[PDB]
Design a protein around this ligand. Sequence first.
Ligand SMILES: Cc1c(Cl)c(OCC(=O)N2CCN(C)CC2)nc2sc(C(=O)NC3CC3)c(N)c12
Ligand SMILES: CC(=O)OCC[N+](C)(C)C
Lengths: 56, 338, 265, 218, 236
Amino acid sequence: ASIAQARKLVEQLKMEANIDRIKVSKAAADLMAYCEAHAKEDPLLTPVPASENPFR
Amino acid sequence: ELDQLRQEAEQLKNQIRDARKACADATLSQITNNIDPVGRIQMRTRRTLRGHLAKIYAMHWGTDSRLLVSASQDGKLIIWDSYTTNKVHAIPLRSSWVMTCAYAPSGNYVACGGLDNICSIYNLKTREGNVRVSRELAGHTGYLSCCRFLDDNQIVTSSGDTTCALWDIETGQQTTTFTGHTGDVMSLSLAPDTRLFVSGACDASAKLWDVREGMCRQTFTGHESDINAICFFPNGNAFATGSDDATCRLFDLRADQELMTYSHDNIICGITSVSFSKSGRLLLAGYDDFNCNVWDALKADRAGVLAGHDNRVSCLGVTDDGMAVATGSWDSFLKIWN
Amino acid sequence: VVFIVLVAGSLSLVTIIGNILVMVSIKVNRHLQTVNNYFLFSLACADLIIGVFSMNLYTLYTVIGYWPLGPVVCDLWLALDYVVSNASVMNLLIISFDRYFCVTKPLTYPVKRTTKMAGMMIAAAWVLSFILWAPAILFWQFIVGVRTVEDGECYIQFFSNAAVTFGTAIAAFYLPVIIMTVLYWHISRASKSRIKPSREKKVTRTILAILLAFIITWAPYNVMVLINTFIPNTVWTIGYWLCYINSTINPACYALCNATFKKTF
Amino acid sequence: TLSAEDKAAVERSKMIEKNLKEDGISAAKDVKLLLLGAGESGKSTIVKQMKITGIVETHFTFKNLHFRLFDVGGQRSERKKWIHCFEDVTAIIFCVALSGYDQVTNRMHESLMLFDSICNNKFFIDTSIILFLNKKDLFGEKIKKSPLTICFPEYTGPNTYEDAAAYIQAQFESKNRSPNKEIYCHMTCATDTNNIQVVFDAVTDIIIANNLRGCGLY
Amino acid sequence: DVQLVESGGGLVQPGGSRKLSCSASGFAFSSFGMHWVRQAPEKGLEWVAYISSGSGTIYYADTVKGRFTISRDDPKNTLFLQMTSLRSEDTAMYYCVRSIYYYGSSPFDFWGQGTTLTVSSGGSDIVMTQATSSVPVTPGESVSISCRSSKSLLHSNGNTYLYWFLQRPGQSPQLLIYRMSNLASGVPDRFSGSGSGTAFTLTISRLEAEDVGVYYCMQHLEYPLTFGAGTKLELK
Ligand SMILES: Cc1c(Cl)c(OCC(=O)N2CCN(C)CC2)nc2sc(C(=O)NC3CC3)c(N)c12
Ligand SMILES: CC(=O)OCC[N+](C)(C)C
């Protein structure tokens, strides 16, 4: 009866073994670019003056 | 015939590992040798919210970055005003053992769940004044761990029966069921475009589902213990997972593998909550040793600590405009940092 | 005599420093701190003030033979002395009350009590003492008509004057002692094991220790005062110095007896 | 003040806080207990004297005291994840059957190991355990024709009844190893009234001990 | 359903006394604030009293203080108004409104139907002006109405307290806009509002025949509350 379970497992592995992949350095560059672009819109890493901080 | 399929599975996993090794050329820490460090980050307790009596288990912000929900084991679910430290509602619960809470994106409904195996959905804008229970969803066989709203008509829940579900509120019927994990699933996070999501179980594995058809698409296995919290990167191409071995990692969807690990020898305790910042440069992680740490998401070096709790932080979340971070621990208080 | 001015001065240094070993341990360790440690904190505050000011000043006094510091300034010392002394005694009485309520109302009292309640109790304990003592010392001088106290020494004026001499004694000592004895008797009776170092013996030992400390230290001063109204000048040398010993042992009795405190060496 | 209206909101907030405080005071009166055991242990019996999936909440009152009992054997899930929510309970009721003769691995050894596991847990270091020994009359019938050497290889002594029970009780109490908790023992039997008073006494004793040690009176 | 019914009005000689009652059925009465707004035989609205949830705070109009008193009995969900030494200027319709207050709430949402009371023959307030008295309109047209205050209504919190009401012929007023921008629940998307500080407008797009009546603007920055004369709309 476990034959059905094993068939399901191998079918899932084969269906998830045909996914295209990019090269890693490209994925590293994409995150760096995103974190560099949105640096001026992040009120956490660069502190905001008390004039417009609503929790003051 | 069982051994033949076992050998076939071994061949499949060998192929997967070979492909993952082939697509890897250099590590992300090797790419970040030039970008400047962000410096130390200092944050102060700006507000303290002292209403509960028992330990706090869940917390979720609203869309407008002002309203908040708290779920604690004394049988209360009270929504707060962050700027003026007020209480705007106080919802008495049926079961006193709650492990999750949620706030709808539109601000009209909230959810709750726990060891009673039932996800309760409350209506806030009733014509008759008070708040009422709209539905009581009950299809699971184990306890609930994380509930998230997609819209006002459908919700996603993760349970202890090694399965996840998508519900339809107006009907109460489990529209689609997600299965495949070996042990309890204890975390869940929705992508910004709400088309696909990830879950983290106690078999040291995290999977990526799609809510349209219900098929597991990728499996990531690096950890060595149970995974306790998951959150996406803002752009929906990476996520961070916290486990019970003092380690939290960053996985890339396109590369289909790990990128960095965040552990330092001073810490042995496990993670209970993980979140990012608005731009993705900082990473906030709660801990059992009564504090919260901030990591460099591209350099992997600690940049500060958010201490100030008498007991372990169980919930943690940032706003949609990056102004404040809220941490709630078993000391019955919530904090706001800026 | 260059040693008594030195060895007793160390006691003032011992009295102050140790109470710090009480002030800070609540603030830093944070595991010792509860809702029923504010009372010990207030007692430590009072006992620290007596240790610095009163101990140094009198050590100077008893070696000079008279008080040149101020013929008029002495009222401030006396006010500080009696105010803080009554503060310590009121704190001990309040601790006895709280322990009685905690034992004999086991389930409702801890939840009913709030930090505001403890703060209000401590504030009342201070204020009643200060209002009782300071204006009386500052004003009985005028009701005499002339400041009898000369520059030969400094002390409290209504020594043999009227019945304020008794009332002050009976209140300040004899009320808290009777109340704290009856309360601790009832508490030591409530600790018996219904079921059948026993848990009862370990508690009765502490009760006897605290009661003997307080009664033994404060016995000499008050018994002197009454008969003096109706003392070779020297005997107050020893009478005042026992009260300050009581002050310096309070951080040892109440604070160090708790198991969690000793670990924070 | 500079708070305009903006002024009824604070009044509503204070009303809510008053309600929270009153509810906490009301819910402070009740006593919380947790029930543990194993298969065939007989916890259902001690439950059925109380009444007269998920978590069940058996509920009773005895001598103006409000009781709650939580039976969580139905939660057939990973234990490590849902026990931490059950700390701060007053006491844990443990059910052990005086029938170790058969395999489920011996049942008595499984019960002893589970007691060791629950007694030394990180969360339950200072929660006192109230111990119930069931099948008092069945074990009496059994011990007439069986030795206790089968349960414990090291046993030496009589094959009588009282001594055999005392040995098991001592072996179980051997595991506490902490200085701030106690194990209370009552040998229950079928058709036995009073098993509620054995809980009233224990709960009162635990509350007064916790009060004594909390007020630093030790 | 939500229902507020009043009774207890009639013809009383001057110098008498009378008691009014407002009965509620369909909502959490104990968690609401209730007002009393009155209307002369043909004039506009005039605020009278106010009682809070828990009966903590009570306010009165300066012209009625001392003669009247307001009380509520929340176990039996009834509201009262006891009035003594009646004057000939008190002949009016009397209404009963509910005024829930929290962050994002909608005060003055439900208005009762009112009772008729008739009596026989015998400087720091925020004055608000509505210069127009009436505007004739044709169906399907767009019309704009105005309400000018005296003190600027922008509190430091960023809020701006102005409300708009509509009184249809022979009926009770409804609530349209709260806090100058928030459109009420149940009102058509046609209505919209704008303004800056002291100049206020209300814009109606593609007006139909069902929205004919008189429009009132109310201030809620501080007590007492003040209304306007109200601009009437009529066909053609
Ligand atoms: C507290 C106190 C009082 Cl209330 C006091 O009262 C004055 C007095 O006793 N008498 C009796 C004899 N009459 C002739 C004059 C008045 N006299 C002293 S002397 C002293 C000290 O410190 N003496 C030094 C030598 C040891 C005191 N602390 C003290
Ligand atoms: C309350 C009181 O009478 O204390 C007396 C202390 N002494 C002896 C130092 C002045």
